[PDB]
């Protein structure tokens, strides 16, 4: 699907090399527009990167570092926007790509790269790279970005074949004839921002951003601001228009929300609509999230000083805080929804700052939604599961660990997960690895929880499956479909038969049983104490003391009662609470 999210890992070492590349493949296969940063790092010689073929635009910056691979096929990339920048300076950073026959990047091959709207270029310590010293970078930088830094190292360990003789000014991205830099700014007639040629009638419209196949606002190679169904525009159409006489708001039916550099009739799945017409991943100040009956969340206005919210890591007062710890565990007391993330790390426990004791973890027993991510790299040996989050229902992943993962469990050796209420990972990837004693992984129906095709479970080095089956560690037979989060009848995704509390069971106690029960939506629920259990029949029709087939003791119609109330009554012949004759 055309728009993917990016990552945010900078130069940090991926913790699971064995799955690192499937994460990139999953993010990027089919993606044309990276809503974030494109970071390609720690890739070995034999890494196939064909899934990058379709990328045209990168909203953030592009980072290519510590790779032994020889080619990154980014030939379709037209435009880097530089919304964020590597080291707050660079839109493109190519660093340390080469061995510490042979390996390392040989040619950038960015032949469609015509526009860098903000930021500059850093290229350092690439032993086998050629042609980079050839490029007229000032042509690629936007008019308002001419003073972008360019810090470029040309130290190589080999000789370069010249640019193909096809190349105009001997400026190229590679030795091939399709690798000549095409210039779109410095070679233009008049004051033209971008042209497709030397004439003044080649010249692109003022709303295009990288070039054009013509003079119109529908002929742009990229939009400088917004794409409105094929037309590049300065802004989208407002959701509201004003009555020419009275100025009452009128819903504009050509109305659109802003999403990245697009106009859209509805924000996409995990995003929030604002009254301002944006699609955001977080309400801007003094707003509250409001959830329609569609499950479709809006950022509406605060009608007063807004209620209190539980922020998690990376929000408000917890913005700069690394881990959940003893110092801040009470911050979560009584929270049902956390705006932000929760990260548990070795320092959470092995502390000045104390050790977070396992029982304090119960604060999260009331937790149903996390809007950021959940990351666990440490967890007390004495707890076999993640049941303190039994009631967690959804992780949105509007913020993801390393830009990538919405759920992450590693180095724990818990024994099962037990996140039994977890029904949705709204976005982001699930990385579960290096949990020696962890079974019940493939017992979870992962893709019932995922919401878009760029999501998957990456898992390696947990307890091996044959070792789980060889100890009878499998879903209890009452769980439907063979899907569960741990051992026993409480851990099922759905009971085949009935539910008593959290326990799946074969039969409620309608006919045989110590405390007799009725049924309600495949639940076993108690008959009132004052119902006499009936041999060979149903004992009760519901919870209330007046839904017995017959009374255990006395009756004060309509209710079976333990004793007649002292407004003075007494038991008569047939057990009925008659009133005393004198008060």
């Amino acid at each position: 699907t055309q728009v993917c999210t990016g990552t945010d890992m900078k130069l940090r070492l991926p913790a699971s090399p064995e799955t690192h590349l499937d994460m990139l493949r999953h993010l990027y296969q089919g993606c044309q527009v990276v809503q974030g940063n494109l970071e390609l790092t720690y890739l070995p010689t034999n890494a196939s990167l064909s899934f990058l073929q379709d990328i045209q635009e990168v909203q953030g910056y592009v980072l290519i570092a510590h790779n032994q691979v020889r080619q990154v096929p980014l030939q379709r990339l037209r435009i880097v926007r530089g919304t964020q920048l590597f080291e707050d300076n660079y839109a493109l950073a190519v660093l340390d790509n080469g061995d510490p026959s042979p390996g390392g990047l040989r040619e950038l091959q960015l032949r469609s790269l015509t526009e860098i709207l903000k930021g500059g270029v850093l290229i350092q310590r690439n032993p086998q790279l050629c042609y980079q010293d050839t490029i007229l970078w000032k042509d690629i930088f936007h008019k308002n970005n001419q003073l972008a830094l360019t810090l470029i190292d040309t130290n190589r360990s080999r000789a370069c074949h010249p640019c193909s003789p096809m190349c105009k000014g001997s400026r190229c991205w590679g030795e091939s004839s399709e690798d000549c830099q095409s210039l779109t700014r410095t070679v233009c007639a008049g004051g033209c921002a971008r042209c497709k040629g030397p004439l003044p009638t080649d010249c692109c419209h003022e709303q295009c951003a990288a070039g054009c196949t013509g003079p119109k606002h529908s002929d742009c190679l990229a939009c400088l601001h917004f794409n409105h169904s094929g037309i590049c525009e300065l802004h989208c159409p407002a959701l509201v228009t004003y009555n020419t006489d009275t100025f009452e708001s009128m819903p504009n039916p050509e109305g659109r929300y802003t999403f990245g550099a697009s106009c859209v009739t509805a924000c996409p799945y995990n995003y929030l609509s604002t009254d301002v017409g944006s699609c955001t991943l977080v309400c801007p100040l003094h707003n509250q999230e409001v959830t329609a009956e569609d499950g479709t969340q809006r950022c509406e206005k605060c009608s007063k000083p807004c209620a209190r919210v539980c922020y998690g890591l990376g929000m408000e007062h917890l913005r700069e805080v690394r881990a959940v710890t003893s110092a801040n565990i009470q911050e979560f007391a009584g929270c049902k929804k956390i705006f932000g993330s929760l990260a548990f790390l070795p320092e959470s426990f092995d502390g000045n700052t104390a050790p977070l004791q396992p029982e304090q973890l119960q604060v999260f027993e009331t937790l149903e939604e996390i809007t950021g991510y959940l990351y666990i790299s440490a967890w007390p040996d004495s707890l076999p599961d993640l049941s303190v989050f039994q009631n967690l229902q959804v992780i949105r992943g509007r913020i993801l660990h390393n830009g990538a993962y919405s759920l992450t469990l590693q180095g724990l050796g818990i024994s099962w997960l037990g996140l039994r209420s977890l029904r949705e990972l709204g976005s982001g990837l699930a990385l579960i690895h290096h949990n020696t004693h962890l079974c019940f992984v493939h017992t979870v129906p992962w893709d019932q929880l995922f919401r878009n095709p760029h999501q998957a479970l990456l898992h390696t080095a947990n307890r091996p499956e044959d070792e789980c089956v060889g100890e009878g560690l499998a879903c209890h037979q009452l769980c439907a479909r063979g899907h569960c989060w741990g051992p026993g009848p409480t851990q099922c995704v759905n009971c085949s038969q009935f539910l008593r509390g959290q326990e799946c069971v074969e039969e409620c106690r309608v006919l045989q049983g110590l405390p007799r029960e009725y049924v309600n939506a495949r639940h076993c629920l108690p008959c009132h104490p004052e119902c006499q259990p009936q041999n060979g029949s149903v004992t009760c029709f519901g919870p209330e003391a007046d839904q017995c087939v017959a009374c255990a003791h006395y009756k004060d119609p309509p209710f079976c009662v333990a004793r007649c109330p002292s407004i003075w009554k007494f038991p008569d012949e047939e057990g009925a609470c008659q009133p005393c004759p004198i008060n």
């Epitope: 004060d556 119609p557 609470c577």
Partner: antibody, heavy 120, light 112 residues
Framework: EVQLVESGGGLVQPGGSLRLSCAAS????????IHWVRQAPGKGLEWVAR????????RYADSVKGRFTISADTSKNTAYLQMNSLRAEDTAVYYC?????????????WGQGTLVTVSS | DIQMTQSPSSLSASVGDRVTITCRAS??????????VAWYQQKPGKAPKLLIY???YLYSGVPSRFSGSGSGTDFTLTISSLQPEDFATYYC?????????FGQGTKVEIKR
């Protein structure tokens, strides 16, 4: 003293929805059951629903079953009746009544009634 | 369930005369409902007033000329000295079972 006051009732289209509110006063409804009885124009009294606020247990006449939900917010000392999917036959005047004390299950106190008409 | 069936459905008496509405329970869970029936008075548009509870006990504020008797599954509300105020529909109710059901109503009218 003691009373109840029905409110939030009037006019609705066929297949519509409305929320009757029954404001208790002069006693706390945790101590007893609260009833909705309705009366069509020039017809008898039809019991519609009960609730025991303490635990929220509810019972319904078969006619309204799975269309009118009755609930009770203990904090306010008030009882509600969310009608959905209003049929034409639901056109009547709606009284909320209480049962009395613990062992006294006659409808001793009643409200004033609000009219509810189902017609476009 | 239980059906309550009042009779007559309507009547017309003169001031001071004795009036007698009956109510008849219908079920196959019989026993003896007698002491678990109530009577209510309703005037056009106005909300019902409780008259009698537990079969024969007179509710406060209600004139003594109103009385109620019963035994088995057959119950009787007498009005021993009809007054012009007494124009109304009178209903019986049982709360021996749930839901508690009302009779069809007996319309009283003053022969003048």
């Amino acid at each position: 003293e003691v009373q109840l006051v029905e409110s939030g009732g009037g006019l609705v289209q066929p297949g519509g929805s409305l929320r009757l509110s029954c404001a208790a006063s002069g006693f706390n409804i945790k101590d007893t059951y609260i009833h909705w009885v309705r009366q069509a124009p020039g017809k008898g009294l039809e019991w519609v629903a009960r609730i025991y606020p303490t635990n929220g247990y509810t019972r319904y006449a078969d006619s309204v079953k799975g269309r009118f939900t009755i609930s009770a917010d203990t904090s306010k000392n008030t009882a509600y009746l969310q009608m959905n999917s209003l049929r034409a036959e639901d056109t009547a005047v709606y009284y909320c009544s209480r049962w009395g004390g613990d062992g006294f299950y006659a409808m001793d106190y009643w409200g004033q009634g609000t009219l509810v008409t189902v017609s476009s | 369930d239980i059906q309550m069936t009042q009779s007559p459905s309507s009547l017309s008496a003169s001031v001071g005369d004795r009036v007698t509405i009956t109510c008849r329970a219908s079920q196959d869970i019989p026993r003896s409902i007698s002491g678990y029936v109530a009577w209510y008075q309703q005037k056009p548009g106005k909300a019902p007033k409780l008259l009698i509870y537990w079969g024969s006990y007179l509710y406060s504020g209600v004139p003594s000329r109103f009385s109620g008797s019963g035994s088995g599954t057959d119950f009787t509300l007498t009005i021993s000295s009809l007054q012009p105020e007494d124009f109304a529909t009178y209903y019986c109710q049982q709360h021996y079972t749930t839901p508690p059901t009302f009779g069809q109503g007996t319309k009283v009218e003053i022969k003048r």
